[PDB]
Amino acid sequence: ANPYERGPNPTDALLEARSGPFSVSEERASRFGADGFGGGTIYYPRENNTYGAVAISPGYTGTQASVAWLGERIASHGFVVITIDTNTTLDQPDSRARQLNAALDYMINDASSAVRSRIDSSRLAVMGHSMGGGGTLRLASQRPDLKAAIPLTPWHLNKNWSSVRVPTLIIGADLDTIAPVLTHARPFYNSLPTSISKAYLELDGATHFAPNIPNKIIGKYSVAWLKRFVDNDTRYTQFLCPGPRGEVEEYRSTCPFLE
C-alpha cells in the first residue's frame, strides 16, 4: 500500500471545491524567527498525521496575501504549507529560491511542535508566482531531493532548466503580458528534461494575475500534482493524464509518469 495516501479517492468535485477534506489551522512565521526569508503563514491540517510540506513564494512587489488562497486550499487537501513574504518585495528570482529553501528549513526545524510533528521532512515541494515561480525553478535545479515544483506564470531570465530533475508542473497564462508564455513558461517547460515527470498547463483567457485569484483549475492541478509527486499518490494520475487537453488553452506532459 502507499503509506502517504491521505483523504478519500479523488473526484473532480473534491479537487474543484473551495476546501479539501482537512480543516486547517495557521501558525505565524514572524519576521523575528524567520532566518533567510521575510516570514509567512503556515497552514497545517488539524488532523494528527504526517504530510508533505510545501513553500510558496509570491512575485515582484508581492506579499503572501497574493498566494494565500492557494496555500490554504492546498493545506486543506493534506499538506503543511508556508506562504512566505520575501526579505524585500523587490527580491530577484534566485534570491526567492534561497528564501523558499529557508522557508522549508523553517517549517522542518523552527516552527512549533504542532507544525513540525505534522511534516514528513523527506517529502517537500516548492511553488511560486512569477519571480517566485522563477525561484521555484532555480531551487528545483539545485535540490533534486524535492518531490515537486509548481511554477505559476513563472518569470526568469534564465531560460534553460535542463538540470531540473524534480517533477515540475508549469502553469502559464495565455494572455500573460508580464511573463509572456512564449518567452518564459513555454521555453522553461521545453528545456526541462524529456525524461522527468513534467507538465505544462496554459490557462485560457488568463492574465499574469490568474494565480492571485482563487481559480478552480490552478487549485485542482496544483493539488493533483502535489498528491501525485509529494504523496506518490497514483489515485491522482488520472486527473493529470492525459490531462485537460474551454478554460485550458493547452496541456502537455510526459504522461503517463513512471511509478
From Swiss-Prot:
InterPro entries for this protein: AB_hydrolase_fold, FrsA_esterase, PET_hydrolase/cutinase-like
Top-rank taxon, per record: Bacteria
Keyword Disulfide bond in record: yes
Species of origin: Thermobifida cellulosilytica
Compartment(s) where it occurs, according to its Swiss-Prot or TrEMBL record: Secreted; Periplasm
Amino acids binding poly(ethylene terephthalate): Y60, M131, W155
Gene3D superfamilies reported in the protein's UniProt record: alpha/beta hydrolase
GO cellular component: extracellular region; periplasmic space
EC number(s) from the headed UniProt entry: 3.1.1.74, 3.1.1.101
Pfam families per the UniProt record, alphabetical: PETase
GO terms assigned for molecular function: cutinase activity
Catalysed reactions, as listed in the record: a butanoate ester + H2O = an aliphatic alcohol + butanoate + H(+); an acetyl ester + H2O = an aliphatic alcohol + acetate + H(+); (ethylene terephthalate)(n) + H2O = (ethylene terephthalate)(n-1) + 4-[(2-hydroxyethoxy)carbonyl]benzoate + H(+); cutin + H2O = cutin monomers
Family named by the database record: Belongs to the AB hydrolase superfamily.
Gene behind the chain: cut2
Main subcellular location: secreted
Residues at the catalytic site: S130, D176, H208
Keywords: Disulfide bond, Hydrolase, Periplasm, Secreted, Serine esterase
Disulfide partners: C241-C255
Class of this enzyme: hydrolase
Protein's job: Catalyzes the hydrolysis of cutin, a polyester that forms the structure of plant cuticle. Shows esterase activity towards p-nitrophenol-linked aliphatic esters (pNP-aliphatic esters). Capable of degrading the plastic poly(ethylene terephthalate) (PET), the most abundant polyester plastic in the world. Capable of degrading the bioplastic poly(lactic acid) (PLLA).
Biotechnological and industrial applications of this entry: Shows promising applications in ethyl alcohol distillery processes as it may be utilized for treatment of molasses wastewater. Has potential for application in biological recycling of plastic waste products.
Listed name of the protein: Cutinase 2
